[PDB]
Amino acid sequence: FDSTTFVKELPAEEKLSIATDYSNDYKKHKFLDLNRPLLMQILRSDFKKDFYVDQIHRPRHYGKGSAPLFGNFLEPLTKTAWWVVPVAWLPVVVYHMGVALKNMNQLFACFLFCVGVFVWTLIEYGLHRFLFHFDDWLPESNIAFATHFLLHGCHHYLPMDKYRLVMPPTLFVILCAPFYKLVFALLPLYWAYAGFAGGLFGYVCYDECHFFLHHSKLPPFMRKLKKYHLEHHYKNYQLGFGVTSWFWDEVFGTYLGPDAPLSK
Protein backbone atom coordinates (compact mmCIF):
# COMPACT_ATOMS: atom_id res chain seq x y z
CA PHE A 1 0.00 0.00 0.00
CA ASP A 2 2.14 2.86 1.32
CA SER A 3 5.67 2.62 -0.11
CA THR A 4 7.00 5.23 2.30
CA THR A 5 6.62 2.77 5.18
CA PHE A 6 9.15 0.01 5.90
CA VAL A 7 7.94 -3.58 6.19
CA LYS A 8 9.51 -6.45 8.17
CA GLU A 9 8.84 -8.66 5.15
CA LEU A 10 9.21 -7.55 1.51
CA PRO A 11 5.89 -6.93 -0.31
CA ALA A 12 5.05 -7.89 -3.90
CA GLU A 13 7.50 -6.96 -6.66
CA GLU A 14 4.58 -5.32 -8.48
CA LYS A 15 4.13 -2.84 -5.62
CA LEU A 16 7.75 -1.70 -5.97
CA SER A 17 7.03 -0.27 -9.42
CA ILE A 18 3.88 1.63 -8.46
CA ALA A 19 4.09 5.29 -9.47
CA THR A 20 3.96 7.55 -6.40
CA ASP A 21 1.37 10.33 -6.14
CA TYR A 22 3.50 13.48 -6.44
CA SER A 23 1.21 16.14 -4.95
CA ASN A 24 -0.02 13.79 -2.23
CA ASP A 25 3.59 12.98 -1.37
CA TYR A 26 4.69 16.60 -1.11
CA LYS A 27 1.54 17.34 0.90
CA LYS A 28 1.76 14.39 3.30
CA HIS A 29 5.48 14.43 4.02
CA LYS A 30 6.47 17.94 2.88
CA PHE A 31 9.73 16.67 1.41
CA LEU A 32 10.55 16.80 -2.30
CA ASP A 33 8.16 17.44 -5.16
CA LEU A 34 8.90 14.73 -7.73
CA ASN A 35 7.14 16.65 -10.47
CA ARG A 36 9.90 19.27 -10.35
CA PRO A 37 13.74 19.09 -10.50
CA LEU A 38 15.09 17.46 -7.35
CA LEU A 39 18.66 18.74 -7.20
CA MET A 40 18.02 22.50 -7.23
CA GLN A 41 15.14 21.66 -4.89
CA ILE A 42 17.80 20.35 -2.48
CA LEU A 43 20.46 23.03 -2.90
CA ARG A 44 17.74 25.55 -2.11
CA SER A 45 16.16 23.77 0.86
CA ASP A 46 15.66 24.41 4.58
CA PHE A 47 15.94 20.76 5.62
CA LYS A 48 17.48 19.50 8.85
CA LYS A 49 20.00 16.63 8.69
CA ASP A 50 17.87 14.09 10.57
CA PHE A 51 14.80 14.92 8.45
CA TYR A 52 16.68 14.46 5.18
CA VAL A 53 18.38 11.22 6.19
CA ASP A 54 15.05 9.89 7.49
CA GLN A 55 13.01 10.77 4.40
CA ILE A 56 15.49 9.97 1.61
CA HIS A 57 15.66 6.26 2.49
CA ARG A 58 11.89 5.94 2.21
CA PRO A 59 11.55 4.76 -1.42
CA ARG A 60 9.48 6.47 -4.08
CA HIS A 61 8.80 5.68 -7.74
CA TYR A 62 8.52 8.19 -10.57
CA GLY A 63 6.80 5.63 -12.81
CA LYS A 64 7.70 4.40 -16.28
CA GLY A 65 10.03 7.31 -16.92
CA SER A 66 12.88 8.72 -14.84
CA ALA A 67 12.69 11.52 -12.27
CA PRO A 68 14.14 14.99 -13.10
CA LEU A 69 17.38 16.08 -11.40
CA PHE A 70 18.46 19.25 -13.20
CA GLY A 71 15.48 19.67 -15.51
CA ASN A 72 17.58 21.39 -18.16
CA PHE A 73 20.19 20.22 -20.68
CA LEU A 74 22.40 18.68 -17.99
CA GLU A 75 19.80 15.97 -17.43
CA PRO A 76 21.43 13.47 -19.87
CA LEU A 77 24.40 13.18 -17.50
CA THR A 78 22.12 11.71 -14.84
CA LYS A 79 20.83 8.93 -17.10
CA THR A 80 23.31 6.07 -17.09
CA ALA A 81 22.11 2.68 -18.35
CA TRP A 82 23.21 -0.72 -17.03
CA TRP A 83 25.31 -1.65 -20.05
CA VAL A 84 27.39 1.52 -19.70
CA VAL A 85 29.75 0.16 -17.04
CA PRO A 86 30.95 -2.95 -18.92
CA VAL A 87 31.50 -1.32 -22.31
CA ALA A 88 33.45 1.50 -20.69
CA TRP A 89 35.61 -0.25 -18.11
CA LEU A 90 36.06 -3.87 -19.21
CA PRO A 91 38.38 -2.79 -22.04
CA VAL A 92 40.43 -1.06 -19.34
CA VAL A 93 40.48 -4.24 -17.24
CA VAL A 94 41.78 -6.28 -20.14
CA TYR A 95 44.52 -3.83 -21.09
CA HIS A 96 45.86 -3.47 -17.54
CA MET A 97 45.76 -7.23 -17.03
CA GLY A 98 47.07 -7.76 -20.56
CA VAL A 99 50.19 -5.71 -19.86
CA ALA A 100 50.92 -7.68 -16.69
CA LEU A 101 50.77 -11.01 -18.53
CA LYS A 102 53.46 -9.82 -20.96
CA ASN A 103 56.05 -8.56 -18.45
CA MET A 104 55.60 -10.73 -15.36
CA ASN A 105 55.18 -14.37 -14.27
CA GLN A 106 51.65 -14.97 -15.54
CA LEU A 107 50.51 -17.07 -12.58
CA PHE A 108 51.59 -14.49 -9.98
CA ALA A 109 49.81 -11.85 -12.08
CA CYS A 110 46.63 -13.93 -12.01
CA PHE A 111 46.96 -14.15 -8.24
CA LEU A 112 47.33 -10.38 -7.99
CA PHE A 113 44.17 -10.08 -10.07
CA CYS A 114 42.30 -12.28 -7.59
CA VAL A 115 43.54 -10.34 -4.57
CA GLY A 116 42.43 -7.36 -6.65
CA VAL A 117 38.81 -8.48 -6.69
CA PHE A 118 38.99 -9.49 -3.00
CA VAL A 119 40.23 -6.05 -2.05
CA TRP A 120 37.39 -4.81 -4.21
CA THR A 121 34.77 -6.70 -2.18
CA LEU A 122 36.25 -5.11 0.91
CA ILE A 123 36.16 -1.64 -0.73
CA GLU A 124 32.56 -2.29 -1.69
CA TYR A 125 31.65 -2.93 1.93
CA GLY A 126 33.70 0.04 3.16
CA LEU A 127 32.34 2.59 0.70
CA HIS A 128 28.80 1.33 0.94
CA ARG A 129 28.83 1.47 4.73
CA PHE A 130 31.01 4.40 5.69
CA LEU A 131 30.88 6.60 2.60
CA PHE A 132 27.61 5.85 0.79
CA HIS A 133 25.71 5.71 4.08
CA PHE A 134 27.36 8.60 5.91
CA ASP A 135 23.91 9.41 7.29
CA ASP A 136 23.97 10.62 10.92
CA TRP A 137 27.57 11.78 10.53
CA LEU A 138 26.46 14.39 7.96
CA PRO A 139 26.84 18.14 8.64
CA GLU A 140 23.94 20.61 8.50
CA SER A 141 24.71 21.72 4.94
CA ASN A 142 22.74 21.44 1.68
CA ILE A 143 25.90 20.76 -0.32
CA ALA A 144 26.48 17.62 1.76
CA PHE A 145 22.88 16.57 1.21
CA ALA A 146 23.25 17.00 -2.56
CA THR A 147 26.55 15.12 -2.62
CA HIS A 148 25.13 12.22 -0.63
CA PHE A 149 22.14 12.31 -2.97
CA LEU A 150 24.38 11.96 -6.00
CA LEU A 151 26.45 9.20 -4.43
CA HIS A 152 23.91 6.78 -3.01
CA GLY A 153 20.84 8.68 -1.81
CA CYS A 154 19.07 8.95 -5.15
CA HIS A 155 19.19 5.17 -5.56
CA HIS A 156 17.39 4.54 -2.28
CA TYR A 157 14.93 7.32 -3.07
CA LEU A 158 14.10 5.89 -6.52
CA PRO A 159 15.13 2.20 -6.41
CA MET A 160 13.38 1.09 -9.59
CA ASP A 161 14.78 3.99 -11.58
CA LYS A 162 16.59 1.95 -14.21
CA TYR A 163 18.92 4.79 -15.25
CA ARG A 164 20.00 5.91 -11.76
CA LEU A 165 21.25 2.65 -10.33
CA VAL A 166 24.73 2.10 -11.72
CA MET A 167 27.48 4.62 -10.99
CA PRO A 168 27.94 7.18 -13.78
CA PRO A 169 31.57 7.13 -15.06
CA THR A 170 31.72 10.86 -14.36
CA LEU A 171 31.51 9.95 -10.66
CA PHE A 172 33.38 6.66 -10.78
CA VAL A 173 36.44 8.38 -12.21
CA ILE A 174 36.44 10.71 -9.21
CA LEU A 175 35.99 7.89 -6.69
CA CYS A 176 38.50 5.52 -8.31
CA ALA A 177 41.13 8.22 -8.79
CA PRO A 178 42.55 7.86 -5.27
CA PHE A 179 42.65 4.05 -5.39
CA TYR A 180 44.44 3.95 -8.77
CA LYS A 181 47.18 6.40 -7.78
CA LEU A 182 47.66 4.55 -4.50
CA VAL A 183 48.03 1.06 -5.99
CA PHE A 184 50.69 2.14 -8.48
CA ALA A 185 52.56 4.04 -5.77
CA LEU A 186 52.98 1.06 -3.46
CA LEU A 187 53.12 -2.05 -5.65
CA PRO A 188 55.66 -2.70 -8.42
CA LEU A 189 54.54 -1.59 -11.88
CA TYR A 190 53.09 -4.74 -13.40
CA TRP A 191 51.91 -5.85 -9.96
CA ALA A 192 49.91 -2.65 -9.82
CA TYR A 193 48.63 -3.42 -13.32
CA ALA A 194 47.37 -6.87 -12.33
CA GLY A 195 45.95 -5.81 -8.97
CA PHE A 196 44.18 -2.75 -10.32
CA ALA A 197 42.77 -4.72 -13.24
CA GLY A 198 41.38 -7.16 -10.69
CA GLY A 199 39.82 -4.47 -8.52
CA LEU A 200 38.25 -2.77 -11.52
CA PHE A 201 36.75 -6.01 -12.84
CA GLY A 202 35.41 -6.62 -9.35
CA TYR A 203 33.76 -3.22 -9.54
CA VAL A 204 32.16 -4.04 -12.88
CA CYS A 205 30.80 -7.23 -11.32
CA TYR A 206 29.51 -5.17 -8.40
CA ASP A 207 27.60 -2.66 -10.50
CA GLU A 208 26.16 -5.29 -12.82
CA CYS A 209 25.13 -7.51 -9.91
CA HIS A 210 23.64 -4.53 -8.10
CA PHE A 211 21.62 -3.63 -11.19
CA PHE A 212 20.29 -7.10 -11.92
CA LEU A 213 19.37 -7.50 -8.25
CA HIS A 214 16.69 -4.87 -8.88
CA HIS A 215 15.56 -5.29 -12.48
CA SER A 216 15.62 -9.04 -13.22
CA LYS A 217 14.43 -12.50 -12.19
CA LEU A 218 17.81 -14.04 -11.41
CA PRO A 219 18.62 -17.79 -11.23
CA PRO A 220 17.75 -19.41 -7.84
CA PHE A 221 21.28 -19.35 -6.38
CA MET A 222 21.26 -15.55 -6.45
CA ARG A 223 17.66 -15.05 -5.34
CA LYS A 224 18.82 -15.26 -1.73
CA LEU A 225 21.20 -12.37 -2.38
CA LYS A 226 18.42 -10.49 -4.17
CA LYS A 227 16.16 -10.89 -1.14
CA TYR A 228 19.10 -9.80 1.00
CA HIS A 229 19.85 -6.53 -0.79
CA LEU A 230 16.16 -5.77 -1.34
CA GLU A 231 15.86 -6.15 2.43
CA HIS A 232 18.69 -3.64 2.70
CA HIS A 233 16.44 -1.34 0.67
CA TYR A 234 12.93 -1.86 2.04
CA LYS A 235 13.51 -3.13 5.61
CA ASN A 236 16.74 -1.89 7.23
CA TYR A 237 19.50 0.32 5.81
CA GLN A 238 21.77 0.07 8.85
CA LEU A 239 22.69 -3.46 7.75
CA GLY A 240 23.37 -5.55 4.65
CA PHE A 241 26.12 -3.45 3.10
CA GLY A 242 27.34 -6.38 1.03
CA VAL A 243 25.65 -6.54 -2.36
CA THR A 244 27.83 -9.17 -4.00
CA SER A 245 28.01 -11.13 -0.76
CA TRP A 246 26.93 -10.84 2.86
CA PHE A 247 30.37 -12.20 3.68
CA TRP A 248 31.67 -8.90 5.05
CA ASP A 249 28.32 -8.58 6.80
CA GLU A 250 29.00 -11.78 8.73
CA VAL A 251 32.59 -10.70 9.27
CA PHE A 252 31.94 -7.19 10.58
CA GLY A 253 28.74 -8.20 12.35
CA THR A 254 26.28 -6.33 10.16
CA TYR A 255 24.43 -9.33 8.76
CA LEU A 256 20.79 -8.79 7.84
CA GLY A 257 19.17 -11.86 9.34
CA PRO A 258 15.43 -12.53 9.69
CA ASP A 259 15.64 -11.41 13.33
CA ALA A 260 16.67 -7.93 12.18
CA PRO A 261 14.41 -5.11 13.42
CA LEU A 262 13.12 -2.20 11.34
CA SER A 263 14.87 1.17 11.16
CA LYS A 264 13.89 4.28 13.13
Residues that constitute the known binding site for Zn(2+): 128, 133, 152, 155-156, 210, 214, 229, 232-233
Contacts of 36 (CB under 8 A, 6+ apart): 68, 71
The Cα–Cα gap between 209 and 222 comes to 10
CB count, 10 Å around CB of 125?
22
Sign of CA dihedral 121, 127, 133, 137: positive
Cβ distance 255 to 249 under 8 Å?
yes
Binding-site residues from annotation: 128, 133, 152, 155-156, 210, 214, 229, 232-233
The Cα–Cα gap between 108 and 94 comes to 16
The Cα–Cα gap between 122 and 130 comes to 12
Reference 61, options 130, 92, 15; nearest CA is 15
